[PDB]
Amino acid sequence: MARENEMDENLEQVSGIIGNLRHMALDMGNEIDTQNRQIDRIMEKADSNKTRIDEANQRATKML
Amino acid sequence: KLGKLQYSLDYDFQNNQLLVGIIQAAELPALDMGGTSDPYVKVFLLPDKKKKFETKVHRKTLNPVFNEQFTFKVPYSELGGKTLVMAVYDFDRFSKHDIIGEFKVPMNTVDFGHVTEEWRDLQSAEKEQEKLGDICFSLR
Numbered sequence: 721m722a723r724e725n726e727m728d729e730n731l732e733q734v735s736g737i738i739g740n741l742r743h744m745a746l747d748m749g750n751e752i753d754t755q756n757r758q759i760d761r762i763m764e765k766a767d768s769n770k771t772r773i774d775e776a777n778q779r780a781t782k783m784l
Numbered sequence: 785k786l787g788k789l790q791y792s793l794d795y796d797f798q799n800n801q802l803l804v805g806i807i808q809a810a811e812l813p814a815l816d817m818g819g820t821s822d823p824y825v826k827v828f829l830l831p832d833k834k835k836k837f838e839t840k841v842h843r844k845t846l847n848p849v850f851n852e853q854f855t856f857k858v859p860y861s862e863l864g865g866k867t868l869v870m871a872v873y874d875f876d877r878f879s880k881h882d883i884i885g886e887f888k889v890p891m892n893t894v895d896f897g898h899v900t901e902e903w904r905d906l907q908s909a910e911k912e913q914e915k916l917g918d919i920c921f922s923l924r
């Protein structure tokens with residue numbers, strides 16, 4: 721039974737570690753989502769400023 | 785110049801209610817003695833000033849973290865013509881609580897479907913002539 725119990729302990733530890741892995745996976749995924757939303761925001765602003773600076777550069781070189 | 789405000793906004797279609805979350809604020813100007821103010825945020829629906837929601841008062845921080853949530857039981861049809869107001873106030877025990885800042889969000893510019901959460905710069909609240917009447921006549 722020592723063979724079996726030893727293994728039992730192993731499976732229990734694996735269980736705990738798996739639970740922790742679950743929590744970590746949840747935090748991971750959530751923060752990944754939020755960061756993705758933030759990146760979307762960044763690309764919106766970056767395109768806005770791209771247009772801004774293109775138009776501004778054209779208007780600036782226009783008076784030359 | 786007072787500072788910025790991080791907030792969250794989304795709509796629950798299952799209960800037909802607006803979920804407004806006050807996350808935090810940053811770089812708020814100091815108006816109190818210790819070098820830091822006592823800030824608290826008043827949030828209410830912009831269209832009608834009824835049932836305004838107030839957060840808990842944080843003591844002496846120019847970067848207060850509220851992480852609070854408020855629910856506005858408003859249908860989705862009426863929501864479109866309704867605005868949100870988030871004003872930052874400074875608490876004072878012996879006088880009028882001065883307004884630090886304010887921010888207004890039109891619900892026609894807001895896009896629901898994805899959970900929104902952003903930082904927006906605070907501005908100074910508006911204080912025009914009271915009468916607003918006019919008289920017309922002819923001179924000859």
Ligand SMILES: [Mg+2]
Pocket residue numbers: 816821822874875876877
């Ligand atoms: Mg005070």
